[PDB]
């Protein structure tokens, strides 16, 4: 019911007319399950079940936007500390409103 397809000698021919099923690469293919396939389809196409609810907005804001806000605040604090550490004047960052034009330290200058 089966036969060896591969030939190391190089005399390989595919027996498409052979009564016996070749032991080709498809021999070892996984059989698969109907419900697992539908679970895969459901999980990939989870945007179909997306619904805007106040709970969904709450979750998205509190975790994603919350983490962005926390990271931005921490980065701003670190920049302020580094400016105090280095001796630089308060730097004009994009959303900080500063009446100083200091952006890039002059290498030649001693701070």
């Amino acid at each position: 019911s089966s036969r060896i397809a591969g030939d190391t000698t190089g005399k390989y021919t595919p027996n498409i007319f052979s009564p016996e099923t070749p032991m080709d690469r498809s021999f070892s293919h996984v059989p698969k399950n109907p419900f697992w396939e539908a679970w895969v389809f459901r999980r990939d196409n989870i945007q179909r079940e997306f619904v805007w609810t106040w709970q969904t907005i709450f979750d998205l804001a509190t975790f994603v936007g919350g983490l962005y806000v926390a990271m931005y605040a921490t980065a701003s604090f670190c920049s302020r500390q580094n400016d105090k550490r280095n001796g630089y004047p308060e730097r004009n960052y994009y959303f900080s409103d500063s009446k100083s034009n200091f952006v890039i330290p002059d290498e030649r200058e001693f701070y």
């Binding site: 990939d44 989870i46 945007q47 997306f50 998205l60 975790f63 994603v64």
Partner: protein
């Protein structure tokens, strides 16, 4: 000469794990133990040269392992007195375990791969111990972590074993993340990664907390002890190595190598870990789990002693090296007992005709665990308890921990030997060859030599204490042993249940931390990138 031992272990690993087809099961059963025996001779030479004769050596294999701008690190080995002692202890225990695995793992399919894992496992421990700079230590640290991952999960068709390996990997990942943070701090403000220029008299608290958080991972302390109990899923030779020397001791070795710890944190954490480990070992009914909780308690003692005095680092290392021996013996004898009885539960063990050597080794290791006078464990534990009297809070908790340790140690001894036979009427047998006898002879020789040579220079130095204070640990251990022999009830059923669940540290993680982790994953993926941001 100093390099040779690491070469022998890594050669055993490569030979057994890559050419084991040619070598065979017998080929592993020769090349492993022979190579580790040669490494034992080399380690003995190292110990005599460095410790006894005070001759430290530095071997730089190559320079600029990482050379990016100012950041510069080299692969160098410095064998200082701490490193020689840990190297000798590790190689001795690993040679014993390799002798043990020849007969124990014969019924296992991949004995060659197991031997290869064991030898690379020892080699990475020696890389950690002998490194001259922080990066070599990190290399050894991660090597032992990955080797533990590949050894605990050896039985891949068991969901429990692979989940235990995943637990170990994740917890150790968090710990070395904290260590890497401390490493970066120390490079930035000291100029180097080498321990010589690493010295800082004053260090900011953040570095100390990061070092402690990294150390409590491998040296399983509280909130980081979950992996040690689950590490029982692996084969018995793995458990002996991980609990005796390689994994648990590494945190203590790091804390002793760099004295950046804070007295207040280490003492409280260690005493809490010792008490909790003893209490958990009280409830346990597997033979192997009780010994792991005892390992936790001994780690708690060693961590606590750092807070007491300046000699605390020496006392901790002495207890470390003493503990490796009798703990490794306890695991190996427990594993042989499981094989002979085909059982893991203490209830069904009982008196049965056996080998005099194994029963004696179990008895002597348990006596060292208890604190029996004039033994290697006794001195290394009284050095901690007597010197902890100044810290009143630490001393009390350690004395109660000694009571609990005595109780469960005596209970295990009575259940294994004194109790009547509890297993069924079936043909069960494990005949021991001369190789296992050589293994237990090596452990017994280590135990005997520990008495004559000692553990620390200040071991017998006087602690100026009243006699009733100094001899108190013996009385507490004796009372615990007598209560354990009678198998009396110490706690109510509610607290016994609480201790059986190990304090519910894992159930809290399950119900809150893991659920929050996967709800964060749900928000990140389902709601946002495959939700809000996915087209119809």
């Amino acid at each position: 000469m100093f390099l040779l031992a690491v070469y022998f272990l890594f050669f055993s690993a490569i030979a057994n794990g890559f050419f084991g087809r040619y070598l065979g099961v017998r080929g592993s059963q020769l090349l492993g133990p022979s190579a580790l025996f040669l490494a034992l001779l080399c380690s003995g030479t190292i110990f005599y040269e460095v410790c006894i004769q005070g001759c430290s050596t530095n071997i730089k294999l190559f320079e600029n392992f990482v050379y990016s701008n100012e950041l510069n690190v080299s692969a160098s080995f410095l064998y200082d007195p701490l490193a020689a002692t840990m190297t000798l202890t590790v190689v001795w225990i690993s040679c014993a375990v390799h002798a043990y695995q020849n007969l124990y793992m014969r019924g296992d399919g991949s004995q060659t791969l197991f031997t290869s894992y064991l030898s690379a496992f020892t080699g990475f421990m020696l890389i950690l111990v002998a490194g001259q700079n922080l990066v070599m230590l990190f290399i050894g640290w991660e090597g032992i972590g990955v080797c533990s991952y590949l050894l605990i999960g050896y039985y891949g068709s068991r969901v429990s074993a692979v989940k235990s390996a995943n637990k170990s990997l994740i917890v150790n990942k968090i710990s070395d993340g904290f260590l890497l943070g401390s490493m970066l701090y120390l490079w930035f403000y000291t100029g180097s990664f080498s321990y010589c220029s690493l010295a800082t008299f004053q260090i900011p608290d953040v570095v100390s907390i990061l070092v402690l958080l990294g150390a409590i991972g491998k040296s399983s302390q509280l909130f980081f002890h979950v992996w040690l109990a689950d590490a029982m899923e692996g084969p018995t030779p793995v458990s002996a190595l991980i609990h005796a020397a390689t994994l648990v001791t590494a945190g203590i070795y790091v804390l002793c190598k760099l004295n950046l710890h804070s007295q207040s944190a280490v003492g409280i954490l260690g005493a809490a870990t010792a008490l909790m480990g003893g209490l958990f070992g009280l409830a346990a009914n597997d033979l192997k789990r009780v010994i792991a909780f005892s390992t936790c308690s001994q780690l708690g003692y060693m961590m606590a002693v750092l807070s007491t005095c300046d000699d605390g680092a020496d006392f901790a290392m002495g207890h470390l090296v003493s503990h490796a021996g009798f703990k490794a013996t306890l695991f190996l004898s427990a594993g042989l007992s499981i094989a002979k009885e085909n059982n893991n539960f203490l209830n069904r063990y009982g008196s049965r005709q056996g080998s005099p050597t194994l029963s004696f080794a179990t008895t002597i290791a348990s006596l060292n665990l208890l604190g029996f006078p004039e033994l290697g464990g006794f001195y290394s534990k009284e050095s901690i308890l007597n010197n902890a009297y100044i810290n009143q809070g630490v001393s009390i908790i350690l004395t109660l921990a000694t009571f609990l340790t005595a109780f469960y140690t005596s209970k295990v001894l009575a259940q294994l030997y004194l109790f009547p036979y509890g297993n069924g009427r079936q043909q069960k047998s494990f005949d021991i060859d001369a190789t296992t006898l050589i293994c237990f002879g090596l452990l017994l020789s280590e135990m005997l030599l520990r008495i004559f040579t000692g553990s620390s220079l200040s071991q017998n130095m006087t602690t100026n204490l009243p006699a009733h204070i100094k001899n108190l640990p013996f009385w507490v251990a004796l009372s615990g042993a007598l209560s354990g022999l009678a198998t009396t009830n110490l706690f109510s059923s509610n607290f016994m249940r609480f201790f059986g669940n190990r304090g519910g540290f894992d159930v809290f993680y399950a119900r809150k931390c893991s659920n929050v982790f996967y709800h964060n994953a749900y928000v990140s993926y389902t709601l946002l990138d495959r939700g809000f941001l996915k087209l119809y």
